[PDB]
Every structure is written in C-alpha cells, then in structure tokens.
Amino acid sequence: LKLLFVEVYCTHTAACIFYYLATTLPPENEGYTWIGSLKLGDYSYENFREIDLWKRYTTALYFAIVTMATVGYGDIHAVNLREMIFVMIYVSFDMVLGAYLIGNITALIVKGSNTERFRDKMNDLISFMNRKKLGRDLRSQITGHVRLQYDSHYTDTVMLQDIPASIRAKIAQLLYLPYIKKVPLFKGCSTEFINQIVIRLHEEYFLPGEVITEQGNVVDHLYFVCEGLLEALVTKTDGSEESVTLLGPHTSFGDISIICNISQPFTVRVCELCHLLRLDKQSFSNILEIYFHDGRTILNNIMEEKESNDRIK
Amino acid sequence: GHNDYKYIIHPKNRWYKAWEMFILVWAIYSSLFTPMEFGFFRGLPERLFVLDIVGQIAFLVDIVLQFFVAYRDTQTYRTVYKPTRIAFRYLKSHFLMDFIGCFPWDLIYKASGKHELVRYLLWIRLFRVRKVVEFFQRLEKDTRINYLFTRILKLLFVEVYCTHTAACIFYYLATTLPPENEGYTWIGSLKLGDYSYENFREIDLWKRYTTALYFAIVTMATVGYGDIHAVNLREMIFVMIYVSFDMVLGAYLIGNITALIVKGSNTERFRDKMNDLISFMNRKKLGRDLRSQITGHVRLQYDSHYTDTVMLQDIPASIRAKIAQLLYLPYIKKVPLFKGCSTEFINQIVIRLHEEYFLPGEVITEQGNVVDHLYFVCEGLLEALVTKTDGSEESVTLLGPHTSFGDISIICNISQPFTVRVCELCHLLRLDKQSFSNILEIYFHDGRTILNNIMEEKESNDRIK
Amino acid sequence: ITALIVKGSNTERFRDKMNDLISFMNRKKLGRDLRSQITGHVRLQYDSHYTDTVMLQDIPASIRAKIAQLLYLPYIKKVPLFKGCSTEFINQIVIRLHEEYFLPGEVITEQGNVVDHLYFVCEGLLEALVTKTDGSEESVTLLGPHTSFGDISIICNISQPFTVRVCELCHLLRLDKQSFSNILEIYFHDGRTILNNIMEEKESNDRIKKLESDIVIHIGKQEAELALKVNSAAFQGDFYQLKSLIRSGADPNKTDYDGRSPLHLAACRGYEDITLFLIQEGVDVNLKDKFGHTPLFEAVKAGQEGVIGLLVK
C-alpha cells in the first residue's frame, strides 16, 4: 500500500512537472512542447496555456499514468530536450519503483500460509495415502480429520511450542481449567495436581461416527469431552455393540481402563464433532506418581461416580 | 435430517453437480456478454431477443434450486437439510443480487423510453461471475491441480474478464459522445491502414469489438502500440484507471507465477543438493562407487519419503492406529517373536509402530547403546558385529526379512549387544520400548507365550546364545 | 530468474553469516584485534568450504566414514603419533575428526590451558610457543605436515605444554578430547602403542622433555592411581564405576601400595559382583597380599561365605 501511494504521488508530481516544463518555453514556441504540438483526434492543444485546467491535468496525468505502466501509447510524448531529460528520469525511477512493487507483491504471495500450507499438506498426504492404498473410507477419514484440523487450527499447537513451557502452562490454565473443573473424575484434587493435569492436555477434534478407541485396547490417552456428543459401545463376539452412555460435554472417558489397568471396556464411537482434551495415560500416571493423594481421592470418586451408571458400575 | 424434509438436494449430489456445470457455462456467458450488450448495444436487437430471455430463465431456475440445496455448516461442519434453514442462507447471502440480475433489464430499458440509466442496471448481472469464483474455489480443493497453479489460472481469468469489460466500457465511452463529435472519440478518429472508422456505429459488431479488445489486450500487456489510444477526457480517465488496476493485476500475476516457481520446487530440491554435493565429490575426487552411494542416499531421502511417515504423527492416534492395522499387521504376523499369541496383543503391537527406512552399509544400532526401540526387519537384511578388545568385529547371524532384532536386549533391559549394520534397503518397522512394555503388562499370558518364543529364538541364533 | 537469484548466493550466505556475527560483536562492544581475527577466520571457513560439514550432516555414518577414510586417513597414517596403531583405530579416529583452516600468523591453544580438543597438522608448520617465567618463548618442536599437537596433555593426563603458534596458513585436523577418549578405551594394545610413541617421539621436544620426565612420572602415577581407583571402587561398592574404571585401561592384576588387589577388597567387603567381574578378568585366586591375606582369607576374615563360595568355585 505504501508503494502504491508512492506511485500516486510520483505520477501526480510527474504530470505537474511535465506540464510545467511545457510552460517553461515561451508561448511562441508552443509547437516545440509536448502539449502545444499535441493533436488528439480533432482537438489540437494549440493555446495550451488557455485550455481548461482539468483538461490539461487529465492530459498530463494520462501520460504520467501511461508511462508508469510503460504502456507508451505515444499519443502524448516528450518533444523538448527538457521534456526528454525529465521523461528519462521519470521512467528510470519508475522502473525501480515498479520493480519494488512487483517484489513486494511477490514476497507477500511467497509468504503463503494457512490455505497454502494446508493445501501442500493435503497433496503430500494424498500421495502417501495412494502409496499405502489405504481404505477409501479410511482415506475419507484421514482427509476429513486433517481438514477439520485446518479449520480447527490444529497447527496452532506447533506455534504454541515456540512459547516456553511457562507461558504455555499459563495459556493452558487460562483456557483448559474450567473444562477440567467440570469433569467430575477430578471432583477432589489439589491445585498443583489440577494444574499439571491441565498443562499436558492437548486439544483434538473428532468427526461423527468415528471410533476414538477400540474396545479391549491398551488406552494411552484419557480424554475429556468439551463440546459435542460421544458414546460408548459394547462389542460382543456377535458384534452387537450396545450403547453405554452418551458421552456428552464434560464426560471424561478412558479413565476407567487407565486407572483400572485393564483393556478398554467399551469401543468409544463418535456421534457429533467433538472437542476433546487429551492426556497421555503415561502423563496421568507420572502425575499420580507424585500426587497419589489426589489419585486415591479420585479412586473414591470413581467408586461413588461409577455407582451412577450400572454399565460403568 | 435428509429424510425429515424431502426435495432437498445434497450439496454434492450428482444431479446438482450436473446443474452446477450447466449454470457455470451460463454464468460465464452472462458475465462475458453483459459488457458486450451494455457497451456495443444501446438496446439489444431483436435478433438475439430469444437468447437473452432464455439466459435469464436459466438463472431463474437456479434462483429456485438454491432454495432447496443443502449447505455444509461452518459451525457444526455438518450438512444442514431444512428448507426453513436453507432459505435463509440464500435470502441473506446472494438472493438480492441474483434476483435483481434476473429481471429483463433490456426489455425494461426498451419499455421506459430508452433511458440509459436504466440500462446501467445491466451491470448487476456481472455478479453471476460468483459462480465461476465458486468453481475455482472448489477446484482449489482438488489435489489434482496445484493451489498456486489454480491461483495463476484464476488471475488469468481475471485478466480475461477485466480486458473484456474494459474494451466494452471503452467502446461505450466512445458512444457516449454524440455522433457529430465522433471524431473526438478514440474509435471515430481511427485510421488503421486505409480503413477509417468514420461511421463507427454502423460497423459490424465483431469488427468494433475486435478493435476495442485489441486495445484492451495490447494495454493488458502494456505493449501500447499507440495506434489505438484515448482521445477524450472520459477515455483518458478510464485508460488511467484501467492501466493502474492492470499494473496491480499484472504485478500479482508475476508474483503468483514467481511464488509457484520458488515455493513449488519438489525434485528441484534434490537437484540443488546434488549441485553442491557433486561439487564436493569432484573437488575431493571421491571414488565413483562412493559417489554412487552418496547420490543413492540423497535420492533415497526423496525416495523413502520419511516425511510421508512423519505426517502420521499429526494424524490422530486412532486413525493412525487403523492405518497401522491395515499396513503393518502382515509384517507383524511375519515376526517369529510374536508367532501365536492373542489377536488383541498382536493388534496392540500393530497400533504403536513407527515405520523407518535405512541405507546400505550404514549402521543402525550400536553395541553398548541402551536399546530404545524394538526393530522388525520386514523387507531387508541386517547384520550385527561386535568390536572386541583388539577391535576386530564379531560377525553374527544375519537378520533377513520377516525377523525381529533388538527384542532380546529390550526383554532383558540391557544395552544393545552388537553394533548392527544395514546391508541394504530395509523396511525397519519400529516399536518403542515403553509401548511394548505396557502392552506386555496388559497381556501377561501373551507375554509368557513370547517368552517361550524367546527361548526358541535364543537357541535359533548362537550369538543370542 | 527470480528463483535463481533468490536460491541464495554462496557469497550472500557468507555476507549474511558475517553481518549477524558483526552485529553481535558491536552489540558486545568488542575489540579491533579480536574482530579482525574472527572475520578473517570466517573468511577462511567459507572459501575452504566449511559448509561441507553441513553437507556431511545428512549422509549417514558409513558414507561419512568412507569419505573420511579417503581424505583424512592417508594424511593421518603419516602422523607418527598413530604409527604402530591397529589400522582399525586409525580409521575410527578418521571417522571422528574435523578439518579446520587457520589464518597465517596466529595461535589456537595456550600453554597451561585445558586441552579439550586435540589437533593434527595436515599441512603447514607450527611453532611451539612455550612461555617462560619472564614471558618469552622458545620452540622446541616445529609441527609440520603429518605432525600433531594437543596429544601430549590428553594421552599423558597433563595440561598443554605449549601455546601453539600458526606460522602460516594451516589446515589441521580436530579430534575432540571426549571422542578421542572413547576410541582410546575401545582399543588397548595400540593405546599403549600411543603411549610408547609419545615417549619415543619426545626426543626433539626439550622443554617438553622436562615435561616428558614429568610424563614418565605421569605414566607411573596414572597406572598406580588407576589401580587405586579400581581398589577404592571395590571397597566403596561402586560396581558401575568399577566397570568404567576397568574399561579405562585398568589392569585387574594390579595391586595397590599394600600389595592388595581389588579382588581382595571386594572379597573382604563382600561385594560378590565386583569380585565376580574381577574373576571374569582372571585375577589370581591364590594371590597373597603384603600381610599374607588371600582373597579366600579376605573373605573368611569378614565371614563373606558367598564370596567364599565364589572363591572356592
């Protein structure tokens, strides 16, 4: 924008100076000036000193703007030696300044982010997927999840890796904290423990119908639903999976298997787009290796809370 | 919700896609004809009276269908199929402009006493180019065509439209002057060759349009021959505006192309590395075989696409897990370490896996280095050696495909016994020690079954003995 | 054309590297002499293709070892410091070295400094500036091509005997203390070959020959003190330090000033694992100390019946 404004000022000044150099010659020699000898169509700018001000300004600015884009129609052109020198200076300077404009626009475009980077990531991912000949539905899952990640700004976490663990912990305690309070799994805990639980959390968004974790699996991620609706399904030998509970907002799941040190009791399947905080089972464990008072208070809360659902109980 | 309210069309429904390709052609024609019928026609002649009417009808139906097609939400990201919800989207987003465009503006102009200001409303039909904008946006999603290439093609179409409209406006500005003063216009004084455009309002439509478009195109590339130039003050002002905007547009075109060349370099990166690396070999006179080894590694870097294995860290855990369950699971079965265990244990090994590729001659694990990863040789051959006190290395049994090495050291929780070497290109599937350890704790019976397989694998190779 | 120009100019990279450095130097308000030496050294680095190491960053260990054995190894094999070595040892150092080019009329190392890195001489002559009590210098050895410096201190566990002086432009070959120490513990007989060389090549060296008298003493107290560390670890119970110490070239057959073996100490203490490892070495089961105590009698004296079981075994 600064360079375009410099273009505006420079062309306006060039038009004014060019017409001025036309006026420097005495009127009797008007035939040797660029405007006094200018015959466009029928109108001949003969007594150019006595033509309407805006007609003269439009003519001079016409030339200036034309030369700025180097169209060089030639209809209006330098005739004098003073006009020759001024036009030389003007176009020589305008070359560099228009090259600066081109360079700034090109640098802007080169600094392509968001849709540009995501597009590149999509192309690389599509190539890799073709190499693995993955399931077309699973291919849709891959593409949909990363598209969601683009819209749900998953790459934000990469940026958050730059800011050190201190300010990062502050970002987490200023955002994840209410959501972690609402979850009843941590009904009673210490401030340090809850802060550590918040720090290691990672945001992730999931697409409806998908499987968060398979049943009978070594769960390595306790999740905390923030938005949307999730659910748990009881797969038997026949495959007649049965609903356990609609994992609504603030319904932590995977903690049962994690604390019980058992396999995933129920396949966790998605119903709507869900925002989930994530905590690696290992991380929750190491925080338990320190604040085990907190963990046994959980264990009591596990008793009383799981009493609610007979499937969970 | 698509059953809840019928007649609703899916956003990517097949018939709607066909109608999109049809209304896209009509939108291109309407946006490329409105400037023509505006500038070159002070009243559309009856010869094309049908062709305009049908045109509006073509969009009139589209005004109705867009009131039934569903739209994917930007909040729940889910397609919403409710006419109550669907209609509001049109009524707010673009219904006004499309509806104003659909009026018989030419007929209204001819039915109001030939008032030009009424004909100025014809430019509302230029907003039908939003269809072409949507088409280009959708094409950008397709990985078939580069995003920057789509950008440059969009900019080329922008130049096409801008030059066409500029030529039409230029001829219109020529027509605004009265015929008796036609000599003051840009066209009424044109004397190209022996042909003078004296009575320019009576020339054939295509000769006039080609002259105006010749001006527009030669000024688009700023060739500025000067044969056709602005003469009026309205013509001067319009040429200044067009020239400035086209300077900006051409700068953007050069920027898009330059960014496509700079950023969009895939094998050129390997070539750039080759440049200075070949300089290295040449200034140091490396053996041709060693030169081949280095070039093989660099090509390998672009041929192993480890980046295509790094991406999986970004895909979430479960979906990555199913990728593993469909690819690494055969390789997992091939392992003699697992052999016959519970399908669940095998599946958990499958889930947590990190595919890697290595280079011939380069070594992978070192003697005395605490094992941190459990490697399966899936497609390749691998050979370990142990440096003694004198220094000579101790050859061991080679690790051919469908085997698992480093497992014993992980089981004993001891450093890597022998410095292992990559003989050639190997599909070295990797399992972290901690993941395998947790999997073993959950599946203790499978763990003991592995222990049996382990004793058999111990007698299998005397170096593990 | 823009991409060709923006791919970076080898000089522009150098200029950018230099600028950044100079900005740091002025930011720290540095002095002219040091600035000139720094800028010159950056110069010699860039035109001698310092970035080759950067290029060598990506090609793996085997190929890097091969190019090393094709460039450095012919030059290293002509260095008498490593004549008599197993060729394996020489090639190993050759994997772990770094060429460096210094400006004429300079200095790297300083008499009495911590040696850290070790240096060879691929080409050029160097002057062994040994600062006296008054402050003057005398060169008792001229380090020409296929010579070495820094070795005297590392291999003999002293500090550098000399402030080395760069007589002219010189390409030398760097070997870190820590890596050299690794490769030196890997090999044993040729490490003693090093030591013997360091003695026999100390002939031209004269003030380093008084250093060499102290070096005779240094080999003496090195093996003695090494044995004392082995015995002290045996008594203390640091089995891990026992392993590391024996892997530092320690002789399990060495006894301390009381003619007491580390086996003896572990026997009287009862550390049957230290005893067992020194057994794996093969220390005499029937050795007698100055006081007549045998590892057997050492074990029986303190009632170390487990150690007695290992001993009778």
Residue numbers in the entry:
A (entry chain C): 202 to 514
B (entry chain B): 50 to 514
C (entry chain D): 306 to 618
What does the paper say about this structure?
The transmembrane region is composed of six transmembrane helices (S1-S6), with S1-S4 forming the voltage sensing domain and S5 and S6 forming the pore region.
The five GORK structures showed N-terminally an almost uniform transmembrane domain (positions 50 to 313 from the initial Met), including the voltage-sensing domain and the ion selectivity filter. Closer inspection of the structure revealed that the difference of the degree of bending in the C-linker between Mol I and Mol II was small in GORKWT1 but greater in GORKWT5. Additionally, GORKWT1 displayed a C4-like C2 symmetry in the CNBD, whereas GORKWT5 showed a pronounced C2 symmetry. The Cryo-EM structural data showed that K514 likely formed salt bridges with E508, E517, and D511 in GORKWT1, and that L516 engaged in hydrophobic interaction with I457, P466, and F467 in GORKWT1.
